[PDB]
Subunit: 66 residues, 3 copies
């Protein structure tokens, strides 16, 4: 894997160190968490204005079905 | 959900933003972790004085059965 | 459990407090995470020089089989 090795190899010296594997696994996890939250947000925000009003919020709930 | 929408809507402007959903999911998780730990503590602290002595600690263990 | 109670009982007063149980569960988790990451690192670092070169990295990948 090429851009992947370069992405992990942050100081660009050809070697992936322990710190770098650790910083990588760490940010990979953070990114995955954001994407899921955003996707959940976007799905509740039915009109896409970027905020959830009490109505959008109301549909979503109901022993959650919405 | 009413007090719930108000609880998430922290700056009180009627709209639940992404930051607020994120701060909410975050503190909800923190609270759930505390409650479980405390419940586990309270259960080991057999006399409720608020500290676990070596005896209370001893029963609890035993390839944990106590 | 003896060294274990002493390990958790950080200020050495004979009683394991809530803070101490919480600090303990916390560092236990951190240690377990490190050990797994290191073991995964060590396994990719096929020659043990302490860094993963593109070759060691390449074997490891392949719809990961290596
Ligand atoms: Ca590097
Ligand atoms: Ca909206
Ligand atoms: Ca708001
Ligand atoms: Ca006690
Ligand atoms: Ca103590
Ligand atoms: Ca190596």
């Amino acid at each position: 894997a090429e851009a992947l090795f370069k992405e992990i190899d942050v100081n660009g010296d050809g070697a992936v160190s322990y710190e770098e594997v650790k910083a990588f696994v760490s940010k990979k996890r953070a990114i995955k968490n954001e994407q899921l939250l955003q996707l959940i947000f976007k799905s509740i925000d039915a009109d896409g204005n970027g905020e959830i009003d009490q109505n959008e919020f109301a549909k979503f709930y109901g022993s959650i079905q919405g």
